[PDB]
Amino acid sequence: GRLIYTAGGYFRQSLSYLEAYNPSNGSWLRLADLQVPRSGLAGCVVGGLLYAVGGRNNSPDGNTDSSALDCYNPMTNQWSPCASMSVPRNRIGVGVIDGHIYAVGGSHGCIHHSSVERYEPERDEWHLVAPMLTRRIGVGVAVLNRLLYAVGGFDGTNRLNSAECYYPERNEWRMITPMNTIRSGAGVCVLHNCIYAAGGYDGQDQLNSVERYDVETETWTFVAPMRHHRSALGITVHQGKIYVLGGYDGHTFLDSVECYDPDSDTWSEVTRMTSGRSGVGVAVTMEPC
Ligand SMILES: O=C(O)c1cnn(-c2ccccc2)c1C1CC1
Numbered sequence: 001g002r003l004i005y006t007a008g009g010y011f012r013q014s015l016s017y018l019e020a021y022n023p024s025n026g027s028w029l030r031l032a033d034l035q036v037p038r039s040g041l042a043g044c045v046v047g048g049l050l051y052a053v054g055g056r057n058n059s060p061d062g063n064t065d066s067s068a069l070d071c072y073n074p075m076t077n078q079w080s081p082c083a084s085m086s087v088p089r090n091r092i093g094v095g096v097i098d099g100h101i102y103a104v105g106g107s108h109g110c111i112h113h114s115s116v117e118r119y120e121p122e123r124d125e126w127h128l129v130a131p132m133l134t135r136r137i138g139v140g141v142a143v144l145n146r147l148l149y150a151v152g153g154f155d156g157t158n159r160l161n162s163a164e165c166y167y168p169e170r171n172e173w174r175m176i177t178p179m180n181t182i183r184s185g186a187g188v189c190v191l192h193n194c195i196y197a198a199g200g201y202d203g204q205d206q207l208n209s210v211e212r213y214d215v216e217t218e219t220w221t222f223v224a225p226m227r228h229h230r231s232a233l234g235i236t237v238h239q240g241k242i243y244v245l246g247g248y249d250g251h252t253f254l255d256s257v258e259c260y261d262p263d264s265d266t267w268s269e270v271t272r273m274t275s276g277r278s279g280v281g282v283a284v285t286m287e288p289c
Pocket of ligand 1: 039040091137138139153154159184185186200201231232233278279280
């Protein structure tokens with residue numbers, strides 16, 4: 001697409017912001033608020049529509065985990081409700097395969113989900129699939145070669161360096177090589193043939209380290225670290241580069257947006273969000289009207 005969309009997030013309370021960043025010219029646009037404030041959600045794009053999935057409304061009025069799926073049409077600049085998931089999923093991960101959205105893990109109160117469900121836009125309907133082998137909240141999710149990966153997170157008792165892979169034609173989950181680092185609330189994405197895991201929380205510290213999984217060799221290798229330690233960051237890929245957005249560094253809710261160039265193995269700061277925040281959902285699609 002053309003723009004990096006950031007939805008929701010958290011600073012003092014859950015937020016309703018939708019804003020879109022244009023890497024070509026450095027500009028930010030403020031777009032139509034989410035109907036319901038939510039942090040800990042995930043964003044993804046199917047057929048040019050942007051989707052916001054799950055999360056939680058942390059508010060003075062109270063705290064409500066979200067089963068919601070909402071859809072934003074850049075042409076109209078309007079949000080519409082879509083079918084809700086079977087269960088609320090705060091701190092969810094999502095991935096898209098063959099036009100279908102997979103919702104993975106997340107929490108509902110003290111329940112840490114291993115369950116997974118799949119949305120079909122053509123029918124506006126969700127169906128459960130096989131659960132992960134591990135309960136995971138704050139899980140990173142990415143798709144590569146039409147396989148779905150769940151990376152890290154928190155199972156209820158321990159933060160995790162473990163990861164696993166879902167094979168749709170077999171409806172089966174299998175463990176892959178674990179990361180070299182425990183990461184909960186990291187940013188996970190795909191670039192070229194590798195699954196990237198940036199930042200997160202290892203139980204004691206927010207991380208600036210980044211590592212990547214080569215599906216051919218099944219090994220994790222560290223690359224250059226981010227300039228800022230971050231957990232609960234947003235992440236996405238745009239024209240061959242990874243962008244990380246916001247997060248919490250142990251002291252400040254970050255407005256920093258960093259960009260990773262894999263040919264030079266360097267990060268640089270490319271812009272700042274209009275306000276520091278963590279727990280955003282991020283995806284890339286066309287510019288609005
Ligand atoms: O502390 C954890 O283990 C954990 C689990 N999920 N998330 C999270 C993930 C996304 C958004 C907000 C929070 C966290 C904290 C960010 C570290």
